Structure 1
Amino acid sequence: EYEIIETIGNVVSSAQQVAIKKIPNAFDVVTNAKRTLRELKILKHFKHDNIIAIKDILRPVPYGEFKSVYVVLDLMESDLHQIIHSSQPLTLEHVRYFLYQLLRGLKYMHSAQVIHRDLKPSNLLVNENCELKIGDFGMARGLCTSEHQYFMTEYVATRWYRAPELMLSLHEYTQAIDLWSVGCIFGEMLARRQLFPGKNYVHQLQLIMMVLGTPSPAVIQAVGAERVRAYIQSLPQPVPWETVYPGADRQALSLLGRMLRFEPSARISAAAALRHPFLAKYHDPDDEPDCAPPFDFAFDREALTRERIKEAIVAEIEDFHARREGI
């Protein structure tokens, strides 16, 4: 059926060209197997041009020897990290178009009660024809949660893009998490360099404070871990986005400012971001769908043995083929 050529990320390999992902020893570790089942069900639930899609899943040898899962996707030229940090063009109009598509993908995603929680340029794929697709859904969760990650929210996802609520454990974990990350991504496109490149937990809070200023007392009281509160209080106003990005566009910084706020409830939504004057060029409500029905994460909260999860994953592969080949 397919012929491999070269390995890309590490396992994904190039191979009509396609990308093929090996998930080796998929059923050997509970965490890895649970993540594979979550990704399967999320990607099958979504049908949207700005969200990665599975083209094919290679079938099962006898069942007991079924160890690895191969997943076929359409090959994407690059990702937004490789584009941002290179000699490629990235004018304001590039920034405007890439931001639109991310936000278009998020409106759909957020309407199904799914929070990505791991948006960074490297997870935003871009093909030869400039379609941007959100990938890598292993960190995604709903509004309700059961996991070590219930506590320890400061270890959720990637440090340079992590929202203050996770860092500080503010007990208000919503789709607003992704809009922080978008803010960082947006800022990073405008300057071609990371906005908040923290070295460790403490330096990451510094660098956010050096732009956003001191957080409010009501935010500080909602920090549960007392040791972090003491550090914040030991330090002696916001820096205007104009002086952070000197040559930048006016409409862009307005929108950026509505994303990078300490308080989750103060952040603009994906839907409302798409109504901002900066994205008027591309904004069409009739072409920017919601996702119905919503995604249920109940299956993830179940404490399953590796073998039950294996059975679950194999049923999602069977159902994938039945919905197209059979029916």
Structure 2
Amino acid sequence: MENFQKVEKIGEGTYGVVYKARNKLTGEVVALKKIRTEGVPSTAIREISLLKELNHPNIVKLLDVIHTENKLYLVFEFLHQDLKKFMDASALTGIPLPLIKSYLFQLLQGLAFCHSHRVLHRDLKPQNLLINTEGAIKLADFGLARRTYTHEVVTLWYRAPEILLGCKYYSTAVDIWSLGCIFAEMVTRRALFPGDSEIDQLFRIFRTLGTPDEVVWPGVTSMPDYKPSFPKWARQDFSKVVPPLDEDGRSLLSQMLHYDPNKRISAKAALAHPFFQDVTKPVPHLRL
């Protein structure tokens, strides 16, 4: 961008590269996502427009969308750290439960909002959850229905089982699943389902929650990628999953990880779960 002074590369997003940049005129500091191109979509244009109007305290603000010279630029409000870095920085001591609870609660408010506006994120993971010094956490890098590019590896750790099983239409339930996996990770300081391939991801989920069947997930054996040959693992005692999370937290997590997308708790209902009876908004200790 001629109007932007790149300060540094933040990373390789999911479609292109992300830079911390300064509006050479206004002096505003922003995150700039640069994408690709041989025609560009139109169905996406509508998706981008809605995302731009989708303003909420727990959703990173999309400031501008600039399509020029076969490149697409998305300008977002800048936040100083992502949750992946914060979790790594807190791995020795662990993120205090009140902060874990505050973050989960804020992310559920963000999801309740996008979901009520029929917007799905589709790819929640620690790297796309951004935090600030004021204790806020926000959803970033929403994925469209429509890895950066070459030499990359997509993280499958937070993928819902119905996606892995070939479901063609995602429901808002896929975001609840990803967030449940993130909640578990903040608590235990270890990824819940660290698969290195789609089948390894699926089988790690099965080994922990039990291989799904028609009793717990009606219709699962008729799904596109389901095979009768899948191994049959018994569900593991849940208390072994996220120690030492309290029963309120474990109850909420179990509801966020129900196999059946229709049984999985909604963001709205999760906000009313007993786990949040004592929620507060603590200040995180951020080293920037």
On whether the aligned pair clears a TM of 0.5, the verdict is yes
Q: CA deviation at 1:33?
A: 5.0
Structure 2 counterpart of 1:299: none
**Does residue 49 of the first structure (1) align with residue 57 of the second (2)?**
yes
Moved over 3 A (4+): 1-4, 32-36, 55-58, 65-72, 170-173, 234-237
**Does residue 231 of the first structure (1) align with residue 229 of the second (2)?**
yes
Structure with the largest fraction of strand: 2
The answer to which structure, 1 or 2, has the higher relative contact order (CA under 8 A, 6+ apart) is 1
Matches within 5 A, 1:1-327: 3-10=5-12, 11-14=17-20, 15=22, 17-23=28-34, 25=36, 28-30=37-39, 33=41, 37=45, 40-56=48-64, 66-87=69-90, 90-139=95-144, 141=145, 158-170=155-167, 173-217=170-214, 218-225=218-225, 228-232=226-230, 234-235=231-232, 237-282=234-279
Specify every segment of 5 or more residues in structure 1 that has no aligned partner in the other structure, as ranges. 142-146, 148-156, 284-327
Structure 2 counterpart of 1:308: none
> Of the two, which has the highest radius of gyration?
1
Question: Residues 68-107 of structure 1: CA distance to partner in whole angstroms, max 9, x if unpaired?
Answer: 4444332211111111122475111111011011100000
Question: Residues 181-201 of structure 1: CA distance to partner in whole angstroms, max 9, x if unpaired?
Answer: 111111111111210011222
Question: What is the distance in 2 between the residues matched to 1:56 and 1:171?
Answer: 31
Cα gap change, 1:70 to 1:216, in 2 (>3 Å) = closer
Question: Residues 163-219 of structure 1: CA distance to partner in whole angstroms, max 9, x if unpaired?
Answer: 111111356631111111111111111111210011222221221111111212344
Q: SS of 2:157's equivalent?
A: helix
Contact preservation (8 Å) 2:59, 2:139: yes
Question: What is the distance in 2 between the residues matched to 1:202 and 1:73?
Answer: 35
Contact preservation (8 Å) 1:170, 1:222: no
Cα gap change, 1:133 to 1:263, in 2 (>3 Å) = same
- Range moving further from structure 2, 195-204 or 211-220: 211-220
Question: Residues 205-256 of structure 1: CA distance to partner in whole angstroms, max 9, x if unpaired?
Answer: 221111111212344422234xx42322x43632232111222222111100
Q: SS of 1:235's equivalent?
A: coil
When the two structures are aligned, how many residues end up with a matched partner? 257
Contact preservation (8 Å) 1:43, 1:52: no
With structure 2 as the length reference, what TM-score do the two structures score?
Answer: 0.78
Q: SS of 1:180's equivalent?
A: helix
Specify every segment of 5 or more residues in structure 2 that has no aligned partner in the other structure, as ranges. 147-153, 281-288
Question: What is the distance in 2 between the residues matched to 1:185 and 1:236?
Answer: 23
- Range moving further from structure 2, 90-99 or 163-172: 163-172
Q: SS of 1:23's equivalent?
A: strand
Contact preservation (8 Å) 2:188, 2:243: no
Cα gap change, 1:243 to 1:56, in 2 (>3 Å) = same
Q: SS of 1:262's equivalent?
A: coil
Cα gap change, 1:214 to 1:68, in 2 (>3 Å) = closer
Q: CA deviation at 1:43?
A: 2.3
Contact preservation (8 Å) 2:60, 2:138: yes
Question: What is the distance in 2 between the residues matched to 1:128 and 1:113?
Answer: 30
Question: What is the distance in 1 between the residues matched to 2:48 and 2:200?
Answer: 36
Contact preservation (8 Å) 1:116, 1:137: yes
Question: What is the distance in 1 between the residues matched to 2:64 and 2:102?
Answer: 29
Contact preservation (8 Å) 1:42, 1:137: no
